[PDB]
């Protein structure tokens, strides 16, 4: 794997590090075999078929899965956007907050969420079936958590995430930015699962208890 | 059966083919799936070698068999900015590009002139290859004509 | 007949260029030279507009100036009711207005029709210049002063290949 | 003696000649580079081309009127007259003819038969809709034309790039606006 | 759809003959133009990228891939209608020495761009690893005024561009040594790598 | 010699009386070798203010209204990208004809101009003709500077000519990078070959 610049032609990559994941199959190395089933992450992109060796090749992913902790969620490329749009309750209460010279050149959001509950999106990026995914929450923030976790995504579709039902403590209004949460995809909670081509920000402030 | 390929200056490749005939449908029979890309870019090499040399192992594009191997031979042209034409002939018998050097000489000329009509468009850049459904029949008739 | 000093004015009024050929004197201070151009401006809008019970070719040739040329055949100008060449005892000042509004002004310090002949013959070979060595120019922007350097040493030689 | 027959002349003797393969290829690399640089979003180059050529024609009024010394013409069909027989005889080497004016000589167009901008150029397939490549002289013929206050509106229509019938060009213009005091 | 990188398209030889969709032509047909058509498309070069640089050196050095992308054009037609298709010739030499290469683009890509012949083409005699090339009038910066001399680079990026993709990395630099009654002389150092320098030794 | 950069031209608009010229020649260089006003009509006057490391001059040309030159004026406003209309608040039959000297200099300026307003003669501030705030409403919605000039306090319509000259600066800056001019090598013996 030095003699070719893995880490160009690209069919020959595949084959060799194929064969570099069966010889290490029949040595029966564990830590190489997820090493080179995580490092086939830079070509899924061609030189794929839909499910034909992805399912063949995610019975190489699941004893890695069943094993300790040799794999550790490849692709930090998960979900789009997260919108935290408190839904419709009632309008009967917003509870905000509050010639001599002088020349005039003409030429020269922060939410206050309330009881209510957000919304979560994201895809799988390769058409292995039945990903599956448990327990989604925050990082080091305050109360505003999800509770419950039963989802699986598809092949590869850009899948809604339903019913995260946000409940949260007021705190003062000191004007913090979240970006992403602690998302476990059928293994241990991996980190800050950030979003595409921009950190596609969100902006909390406390509840309110007016 | 035929197989040719242009390779491009990074080893990438730019076009991929093989041709073969009628007799046996599905060419290259467990060697197109294993050992023909192994083959063509382990004898990458002589041919990369052979581009410094004055006289080989007063012409220089023309290369002749350079590798001969389970008697499979290779031909080879080297281009003016490094593109090289490497093309592997197979057969049943021992393989004869002795009996078409006068021929294809005017096959990779025939088709480096296509290499060149396909420059000069300003949108195609170096290092992608060659999407061009014009490509193939300009290919395949040469190959068909002229083998 | 003779140029002692090209004025290059806008479009728009106030000069883009001037360079007085071996006056070998500053009578006017930089600062007079914007005033006198906005005035020859003005006095070419006001030549217009005053005409008598007229309401009706200015066909040049070529002299050879300059010594191939620039161009071979009898042409036309562009300006009827407007100032045209004034004349007085030290000097004589030609202008030549351009079809699209670029004025040149030629003061002459050779006094006493055919001065206009040999005039606007030598005044649309400083056009050619103009249009050759300051259009095709990219730190030149519009409207702004002749800041080109190489512009002077072409019209130079021109000029000294006259008198 | 005409307008036919005047330009070759100075197409003869004193135009600094150079060749047209180095000028396709100095176009194309622009607006390659204007594709790889703008993520392929073909409405934003064809304004950017738009914009590009607007700057040339107002620098390029004064060469033309200091090469040959026209007068202003008369009427929208010599205007046509001399954007065929004068105007890319001179510049570049071609005279792309005129047919097909409106009911009323509102509008017109110019077949325009070689161009000598694109002799290499088969464009990609998702700017096969939204791209057209010389646009660079509806920057020009829209800006030069400016300069003699015929404020003219001109598109492509259609073009043979894109895999069409013929390359044409649809002049419409407006008002004759306002000119220096002297006529 | 016809190479994609997925696979390698297995089909059989001695099919029909197909349609014909596009079909073009490669010989010179000496087409002329003006000049000042040349020196308007050079300066809206300049005059965007002037716009959109910050510093001198990445104006430099972004004027340059313009001139890279004719260079890697320019190489593979040159030498291929000088040896002269479907007239079959007999192909030209694939010159490999550093002044054989220097002799074909002082005598024929100056030939080709511009009327003439580049006049002198002169080693650094003091020292190794440079090689002037020099003229006595460059026609595409000659309407530029003034001295700074960043807008000859879209020619200089032509050279280099020209050499590599010619197997040999080289790097240009333009100057300008005002010689004589040439005012405009500008000169051109290509400056070839170390890791180049051993191969023609061997 | 004359080493400026740029220059633009900077015409001060308004009906007969308002009282332009006095008010150009306190705050601008004035009565160089001008040969007066209405002998040509619209006398020019020149500042130089330096905007963000380039020289500026601008040129400003009071027009003048005396029906004879109506005509000449039209020519005039050809061409003027800096524009600045002046009307006095004692007198109130001004500002009834402001809008249409805005209509008739929108009208044949430039494709786009930075026109200011200015009130000239506010040391008659109680003989208010119109109210400031009116004024500052029609500047406010129609894109222009508006000031309030005393006559005998210069400072006011200096900034103003400093700010009307950064929004039209800014408005045609043309992009600079730079002419440092240092690369220099090559100085050998020429074993030249060719």
Same mark, same amino acid.
């Given at each position: ?210 | ?147 | ?75 036309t100008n562009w300006n009827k009711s407007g100032l045209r060449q004034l004349c007085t005892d030290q000097f004589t000042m030609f202008i030549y207005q351009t079809l699209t509004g670029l004025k040149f002004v030629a003061i002459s310090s050779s006094v006493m029709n055919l001065a206009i002949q040999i005039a606007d013959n030598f005044l649309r070979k400083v056009y050619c210049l103009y249009s ?28 000294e290949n006259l008198q | 003696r005409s307008l036919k027959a005047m330009g070759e002349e100075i197409w003869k003797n004193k135009t600094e000649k150079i060749n047209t393969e180095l000028f396709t290829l100095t176009y194309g690399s622009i607006v390659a580079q204007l594709c790889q640089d703008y993520e392929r979003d073909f409405n934003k180059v064809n304004d950017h081309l738009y914009s590009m ?131 | ?202 | 010699?004359?080493?400026?950069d740029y220059l633009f031209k900077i015409v001060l608009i308004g009906d007969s009386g308002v009282g332009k010229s006095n008010l150009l020649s306190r705050f601008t260089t004035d009565e160089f070798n001008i040969e007066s006003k209405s002998t040509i009509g619209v006398e020019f006057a020149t500042r130089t203010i330096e905007v963000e490391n380039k020289k500026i001059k601008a040129q400003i ?9 109506? #005509?000449?004026? %039209?020519?005039?406003?050809?061409? *003027?990208?800096?524009? /600045? &209309? @002046? ?5 109130? !039959? ?56 005393? #006559?005998?306090? %210069?400072?006011?319509?200096?900034? *103003?000519?400093?700010? /009307? &000259? @950064? ?5 045609? !800056? ?21």
């Open positions: 794997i030095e003699l070719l610049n893995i880490n160009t032609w690209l069919i020959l990559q595949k084959k060799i590090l194929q064969l570099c994941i069966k010889v290490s199959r029949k040595i029966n190395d564990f830590e190489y075999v997820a090493k080179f089933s995580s490092i086939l992450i830079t070509k899924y992109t061609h030189l794929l078929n839909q499910s034909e060796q992805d399912a063949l090749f995610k019975e190489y992913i699941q004893p890695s899965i069943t094993n300790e902790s040799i794999t550790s969620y490849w692709d930090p490329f998960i979900l789009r956007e997260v919108v935290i749009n408190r839904i419709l309750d009632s309008d009967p209460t917003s509870n905000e907050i509050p010639n001599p010279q002088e020349v005039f050149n003409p030429f020269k959001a922060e939410f206050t969420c309330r009881v209510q509950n957000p919304f979560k999106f994201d895809f799988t990026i390769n058409d292995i079936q039945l990903d599956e995914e448990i327990s989604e929450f925050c990082e080091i923030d305050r109360k505003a958590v999800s509770y419950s976790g039963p989802y699986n995504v598809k092949a590869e579709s850009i899948r809604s995430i339903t019913l995260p039902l946000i409940i949260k403590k007021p705190t003062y209004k000191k004007i913090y930015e979240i970006s992403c949460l602690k998302i476990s995809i059928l293994k241990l909670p991996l980190q800050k699962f950030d979003i595409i081509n921009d950190s596609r920000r969100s902006n909390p402030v406390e509840e309110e208890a007016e | 059966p035929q197989y040719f390929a242009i390779i491009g200056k990074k080893d990438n490749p730019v076009y991929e083919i093989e041709f073969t005939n009628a007799e046996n449908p599905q060419g290259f029979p467990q060697d197109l799936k294993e050992l023909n890309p192994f083959i063509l870019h382990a004898s990458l090499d002589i041919v990369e070698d052979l581009q410094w040399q004055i006289n080989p192992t007063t012409d220089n594009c023309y290369l002749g068999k350079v590798d001969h191997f389970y008697g499979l031979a290779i031909t080879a042209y080297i281009s003016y900015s490094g593109m090289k034409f490497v093309m592997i002939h197979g057969n049943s018998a021992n393989s004869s590009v002795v009996i078409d050097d006068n021929n294809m000489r005017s096959f990779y000329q025939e088709v480096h002139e296509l290499y060149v009509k396909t420059l000069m468009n300003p949108f195609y850049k170096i290092t992608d290859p060659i999407r061009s459904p014009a490509f193939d029949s300009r290919v395949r008739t040469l190959a068909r004509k002229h083998l | 007949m003779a140029i002692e000093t090209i004025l290059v004015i806008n479009k728009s009024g106030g000069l883009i260029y001037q360079r007085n050929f071996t006056n070998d004197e500053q009578k006017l201070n930089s600062n007079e030279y914007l005033i006198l151009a906005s005035t020859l401006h003005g006095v070419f809008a006001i030549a217009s507009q005053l005409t008598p019970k007229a309401l009706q070719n200015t066909i040049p040739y070529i002299p050879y100036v300059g010594m191939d040329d620039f161009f071979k055949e009898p042409f050759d060595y300051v259009m095709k120019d990219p730190s030149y922007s519009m409207e702004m002063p002749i800041r080109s350097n190489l512009f002077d040493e072409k019209v130079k030689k021109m000029v | 050529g607007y700057n040339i024609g107002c620098r390029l009024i004064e060469d033309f009127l200091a090469r040959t010394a026209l007068p202003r013409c008369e009427n929208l069909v010599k205007t046509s007259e001399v954007l065929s027989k004068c105007a890319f005889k001179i510049f570049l080497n071609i005279t792309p003819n005129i047919t097909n004016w409106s009911h009323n000589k509102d509008t017109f167009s110019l077949i325009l038969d070689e161009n000598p901008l694109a002799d290499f150029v088969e464009l990609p397939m998702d700017a096969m809709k939204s791209l057209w490549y010389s646009n660079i002289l509806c920057g020009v013929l829209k800006g030069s034309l400016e300069m003699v206050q015929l404020d003219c509106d001109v598109w492509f229509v259609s073009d043979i790039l894109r895999g069409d019938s013929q390359t044409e060009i649809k002049v419409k213009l407006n008002r004759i606006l306002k000119d220096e005091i002297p006529i | 759809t016809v190479g994609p990188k997925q696979a390698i398209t297995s089909e059989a030889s001695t099919t029909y003959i197909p349609s014909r969709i596009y079909s073009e032509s490669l010989l010179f047909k000496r087409q002329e133009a003006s000049l000042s058509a040349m020196a308007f498309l050079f300066q809206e070069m300049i005059s965007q990228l002037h716009r959109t640089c910050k510093t001198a050196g990445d104006f430099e050095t972004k004027l340059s891939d313009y001139g890279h992308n004719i260079g890697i054009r320019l190489l593979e037609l040159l030498n291929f209608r000088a040896s002269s298709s479907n007239y079959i010739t007999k192909m030209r030499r694939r010159d490999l020495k550093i002044l054989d290469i220097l002799q074909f683009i002082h005598g024929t890509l100056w030939s080709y761009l511009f009327n003439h012949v580049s006049d002198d083409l002169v080693k650094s005699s003091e020292r190794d690893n440079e090689y002037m090339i020099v003229d006595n009038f460059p026609t595409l910066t000659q309407f530029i005024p003034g001295e700074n001399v960043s807008c000859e680079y879209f020619v200089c990026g032509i050279i280099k561009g020209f050499l590599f993709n010619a197997g040999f990395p080289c790097g240009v630099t333009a100057h300008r040594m005002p010689q004589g009654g040439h005012s405009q002389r500008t000169v051109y150092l290509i400056q070839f790598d170390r890791q180049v320098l051993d191969r023609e030794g061997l | 010699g004359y080493d400026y040309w009071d027009t003048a209204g005396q029906e004879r030159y109506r #005509a000449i004026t %039209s020519a005039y406003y050809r061409g *003027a990208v800096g524009a /600045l &209309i @002046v009307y006095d608040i004692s007198k109130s !039959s001004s500002y009834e004809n402001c809008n249409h000297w805005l209509t008739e200099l929108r009208e044949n300026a430039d494709d786009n101009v930075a026109v200011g307003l200015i009130g000239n003669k506010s040391d008659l501030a109680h003989l208010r003709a119109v109210p400031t705030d009116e004024a500052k409403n029609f500047a406010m919605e129609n894109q222009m500077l508006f000031t309030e000039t005393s #006559a005998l306090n %210069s400072d006011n319509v200096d900034k *103003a000519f400093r700010e /009307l &000259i @950064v929004a039209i600066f800014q408005m045609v !800056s043309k992009h600079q990078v730079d002419l440092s001019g240092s690369g220099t090598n090559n100085m050998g013996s020429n074993g030249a070959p060719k």
